Design a protein around this ligand. Structure first.
Ligand SMILES: CCCCCCCCCCCCCCCCCC(=O)OC[C@H](COP(=O)(O)OC[C@H](N)C(=O)O)OC(=O)CCCCCCCCCCCCCCCCC
Ligand SMILES: CCCCCCCCCCCCCCCCCC(=O)OC[C@H](COP(=O)(O)OC[C@H](N)C(=O)O)OC(=O)CCCCCCCCCCCCCCCCC
Ligand SMILES: CCCCCCCCCCCCCCCCCC(=O)OC[C@H](COP(=O)(O)OC[C@H](N)C(=O)O)OC(=O)CCCCCCCCCCCCCCCCC
Ligand SMILES: CCCCCCCC/C=C\CCCCCCCC(=O)O[C@@H](COC(=O)CCCCCCCCCCCCCCC)COP(=O)([O-])OCC[N+](C)(C)C
Ligand SMILES: CCCCCCCC/C=C\CCCCCCCC(=O)O[C@@H](COC(=O)CCCCCCCCCCCCCCC)COP(=O)([O-])OCC[N+](C)(C)C
Ligand SMILES: CCCCCCCC/C=C\CCCCCCCC(=O)O[C@@H](COC(=O)CCCCCCCCCCCCCCC)COP(=O)([O-])OCC[N+](C)(C)C
Ligand SMILES: Nc1ncnc2c1ncn2[C@@H]1O[C@H](COP(=O)(O)OP(=O)(O)OP(=O)(O)O)[C@@H](O)[C@H]1O
Ligand SMILES: Nc1ncnc2c1ncn2[C@@H]1O[C@H](COP(=O)(O)OP(=O)(O)OP(=O)(O)O)[C@@H](O)[C@H]1O
Ligand SMILES: Nc1ncnc2c1ncn2[C@@H]1O[C@H](COP(=O)(O)OP(=O)(O)OP(=O)(O)O)[C@@H](O)[C@H]1O
Ligand SMILES: [K+]
Lengths: 331, 332, 330
């Protein structure tokens, strides 16, 4: 419609796949699919797995008792293989007791028939296997940290202002939790339908972008909010963005990828956000945020994304660097 | 007469081994081995471990009951140490009830013989220890991602074509799941028999290859299918290749390694693929795939690996660069 | 031979620490300690933890039964609180049944004395917590990936030889299992004594060394046994080595670190090795180890660390640059 976003502001992407030759890999990764599922759906499969297993073996216990004929009334002329089985519902309760390992012991397993002994072995092994598998799935779900990515907070929209003479595309990212993100990393990409002289056409060319770090690396130590900018050098594809060329249907998008292993669970998480063409404010520096109180600092997240207007030329970066060079040479 | 591949098209590293002076690498690390196995083998060992423990302690319970003298039909002052034991079947079922902790209670342990108490303690500790170990293997087997690694897709044959002036070696990677692979990192290698002037003989010299990314680094953000093109500079070992020297029996291979951690299980993975000489379609470009739907993008995977020919100067990268410099000098 | 290596050929950093203010942080972190310990030590602590809990609550159950008096040899006149408690052994077996959750049911808990219900709650919670903790520690001890790191193989004695004219220090590294090591990473640090002009005397100075990789990175894909070689440039602290200076009584050592997560367990590992001066063979090359089977490639691990001899200039690499410049000038 108006303009498709590659990744939504909340971090979820919007790309739609089509014409996939389903090889069953979606079904093949049973354990991975369970982890992805929501907790209500996980609990439904959890309940259905146990209930189906309990009911399946309950029918088997009823079947073996019916075949042995020990459920019909008897007077001392018989010894049932599973004691006190005089109804199907008794077999159902017996199945619960075995697999859950409750073992009330009112419905025992006698030494008489060997088939019930084999079925008891099978039910115990199957119960342990399913318990172990559900543990694994629950342990991977309780170790999920995608809900940690939500606590990572970016500015509502980014700016482009002059700093140290040159021009840079600024940005702010914040963390709300008290915990730390070990080995953090901020990638940054521009997504443009970039045409090439040789004749190629790319529907969405993803150009990587440096983080303008001190040592030219991707490492970032994120405790307070930081003005994470990108120096618009000659090679930067943002070198030719006219401020007059900032309107809606300008084919632009600034991906941001904040990575880093969460300290608590030890799981790595991504944070994503895309700045559109009309979501950029030219020449507006960010409001200072990190105040100081008595013996301690103070971050004012109320002013997290407020930007004040600062004067700057309304010229493309090419029209700025070239002009400055000519003036210096003439002088 | 059999052209050997260093890795198969689905990873599957096809390199054998010989003369291994093993010191029990199978042994003293059995936990990694159990993770390696399939589920049929895991189930068999799962059942075998429990059945061996159950049957072993069952014999012990039977033996101690017979030692106390309770199997024989004596109703006078027998006071059996393990109640209601009257065969091996009762002993085996009792061993089930202890180690599995079912505890039916029709076969109890009384205070008579303290040796039964010691055996009960041993079986409980062994049963808990084995349950703990088997749980751990299950956790490490449910957090596997080889079944996810198979979802990553690389085109059947990569192309060489001009892009932005120079010559590059394109490719196409793809993901087939809604989940993301955090911190992807594509390392590319050229495998060849390259011998140094000094006489060194290296049969498979794995030379690394830059990804020609915009920031030098390798980390690539993979949602849509992407072109992974290596720009053939004057240093790249591809700088001396022409489509005339690109028949089948030509010693080349382009290993591609797609690293990255799955966001769900938090386990790092790898996807691998190779490209022989014949499987590098010279002078062709990939078809654009990302269309636009009513309100979002449309990756038409049916056109994932189709290429359309576009003519290019059929010369080596060294000849191309030399000819361009000579033509520019003549013009200037 | 008082030579003191920095690390052994199989890791095991041979450095003794002394005068440590051990303020309990070793003992405060119990779970990490329990992971480090061997299996015989773990089993002893495993058994002792459970047995201490069993005996402790056995005393508690026996004590409350005595206090209620329901263990008196007289049978009737009342109804007991915890049934079938006759001797201490009954109380201990009852403790087993509760904490292990076997629950035979011949020794139940009735409504008589409320303190039994409270003690039952305490024992159940404590038993579950101890079981949960031991499960976690066992799980961490099953994802140990140092035994796998013991199957990473480094050649016993590494070499220095001329390749592409320049002079480089080589090394052979290999894997034995069928499982890859994802995101491998080779670091190489020289341990030497540094006496800077400003008077600094660093006893064990570690200068990192570039691996001379085709992309300038420090990552390599290892399936077949690789050849790792550092190209000795004008900035490498090996730029002034000579075959004379390469005997036993030398302050040289080349620590090599092979990192990377193992694919199965998902655990990051290291493989540490060192090459003393006398453990180097100047001017010798590695035998081609990768053969070709009729159908696929081959690896001849019998000729792993075999180094043939080859002619080589017996002079420092610095002099090679000076001679090279003089040759061009001539
Ligand atoms: C296994 C139950 C058997 C029947 C017994 C019923 C009695 C239930 C009480 C005891 C339940 C045990 C409590 C355990 C506490 C665990 C907490 C937990 O797992 O997270 C609480 C959950 C999480 O929701 P979420 O954040 O939206 O999910 C993750 C996210 N959406 C994602 O995609 O990662 O938040 C919830 O979800 C609420 C949890 C309450 C559980 C109630 C389960 C019944 C669900 C019925 C749903 C029917 C309709 C489903 C439609 C879903 C459409 C999407
Ligand atoms: C008394 C106890 C009896 C048994 C009780 C069973 C109780 C069941 C309880 C619940 C079961 C839970 C099932 C788990 C669901 C997920 C399973 C799953 O994802 O994998 C399915 C597994 C096996 O796949 P894989 O080997 O890992 O696949 C290869 C590779 N990883 C890939 O996927 O890409 O496949 C399975 O889940 C099972 C498949 C069984 C197949 C048995 C085959 C016989 C074994 C020997 C075969 C080879 C023989 C020789 C052949 C030579 C050929 C040259
Ligand atoms: C009161 C109730 C008692 C109950 C007793 C039975 C308990 C049964 C438990 C069943 C499960 C056992 C789990 C073992 C499975 C894996 C074993 C394995 O892979 O390693 C086998 C181990 C040897 O490894 P390590 O170097 O000590 O530790 C591993 C590594 N270094 C790590 O960090 O993980 O070595 C072993 O685990 C094997 C030990 C065999 C013991 C045989 C007895 C005679 C030899 C005794 C050996 C020396 C003992 C010295 C004691 C000194 C104490 C200070
Ligand atoms: C969750 C269940 C617990 C609650 C159950 C409530 C309904 C009672 C059902 C019931 O009595 O079952 C009946 C059958 O039952 C069947 O045949 C069940 C058929 C469906 C089972 C499989 C479902 C999938 C009981 O059958 P029975 O005991 O074999 O009947 C003979 C009884 N006699 C030996 C005393 C003569
Ligand atoms: C799935 C299957 C599980 C089935 C479990 C029960 C199988 C044995 C049943 C059986 O007849 O036991 C026999 C023992 O038998 C032994 O003592 C066997 C000794 C060899 C065991 C080898 C295991 C491997 C019978 O036991 P008994 O001691 O001969 O009986 C005493 C006589 N009395 C009954 C009059 C008191
Ligand atoms: C496995 C093992 C249990 C012991 C096996 C032998 C059984 C006799 C134990 C015994 O008499 O203990 C006694 C003390 O003993 C204690 O209170 C010991 C407490 C610590 C025991 C473990 C560490 C040593 C407990 O005596 P009692 O049960 O109060 O005696 C009541 C008398 N009546 C049995 C005649 C009714
Ligand atoms: N075929 C092989 N399989 C597995 N590991 C091997 C093999 N050959 C050597 N190794 C490993 O390589 C190392 C020893 O390498 P190297 O062959 O140079 O020494 P060596 O056999 O001890 O020497 P030598 O016996 O000639 O004194 C050890 O870690 C050893 O386990
Ligand atoms: N629509 C698709 N959905 C899923 N996987 C696809 C799809 N198209 C191609 N692939 C995968 O891409 C690889 C080859 O792509 P390409 O289309 O270039 O060749 P192909 O003729 O489909 O290959 P093959 O004969 O191996 O199936 C294979 O791993 C294949 O499974
Ligand atoms: N032997 C030691 N063992 C453990 N930690 C130590 C040791 N010596 C110093 N530290 C650590 O060094 C840090 C600085 O401690 P502090 O400056 O008070 O002592 P110091 O450096 O040993 O003093 P001094 O100058 O008297 O030798 C603290 O974090 C302390 O724990
Ligand atoms: K029980």
């Amino acid at each position: 419609e108006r303009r498709a976003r590659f990744v939504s502001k909340k971090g979820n992407c919007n790309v739609a796949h089509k014409n996939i030759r389903e090889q069953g890999r979606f079904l093949q990764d049973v354990f991975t699919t369970l982890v992805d599922l929501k907790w209500p759906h996980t609990l439904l499969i959890f309940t259905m797995s146990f209930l189906c297993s309990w009911l399946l073996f309950a029918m088997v216990w009823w079947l073996i008792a019916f075949a042995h004929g020990d459920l019909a009334p008897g007077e001392g002329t018989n010894v049932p293989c599973v004691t006190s089985i005089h109804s199907f519902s008794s077999a159902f309760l017996f199945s619960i007791e075995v697999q859950v390992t409750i073992g009330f012991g009112g419905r025992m397993v006698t030494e008489e028939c060997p088939l019930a002994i084999l079925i008891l072995i099978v039910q115990n092994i199957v119960g342990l296997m399913i318990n172990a598998i559900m543990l694994g799935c629950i342990f991977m779900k309780t170790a999920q940290a995608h809900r940690r990515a939500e606590t990572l907070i970016f500015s509502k929209h980014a700016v482009i202002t002059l700093r140290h003479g040159r021009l840079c595309f600024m940005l702010r990212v914040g963390d709300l939790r008290k915990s730390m993100i070990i080995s953090a990393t901020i990638h940054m990409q521009v997504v443009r339908k970039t045409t090439s002289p040789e004749g190629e056409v790319v529907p969405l060319h993803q150009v990587d972008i440096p983080m303008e770090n001190g040592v030219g690396g991707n490492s970032i130590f994120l405790v307070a909010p930081l003005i994470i900018y990108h120096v618009i050098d000659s090679n930067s594809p943002l070198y030719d963005l006219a401020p007059s060329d900032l309107h809606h249907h300008q084919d632009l998008e600034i991906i941001v990828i904040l990575e880093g292993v969460v300290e608590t669970t030890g799981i790595t998480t991504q944070a994503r956000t895309s700045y559109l063409a009309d979501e950029i404010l030219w020449g507006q520096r960010f409001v200072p945020i990190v105040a100081e109180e008595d013996g301690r600092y103070s971050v004012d997240y109320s002013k997290f994304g407020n930007t004040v207007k600062v004067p700057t030329p309304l010229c493309t970066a090419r029209q700025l660097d070239e002009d400055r060079s000519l003036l210096d040479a003439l002088t």
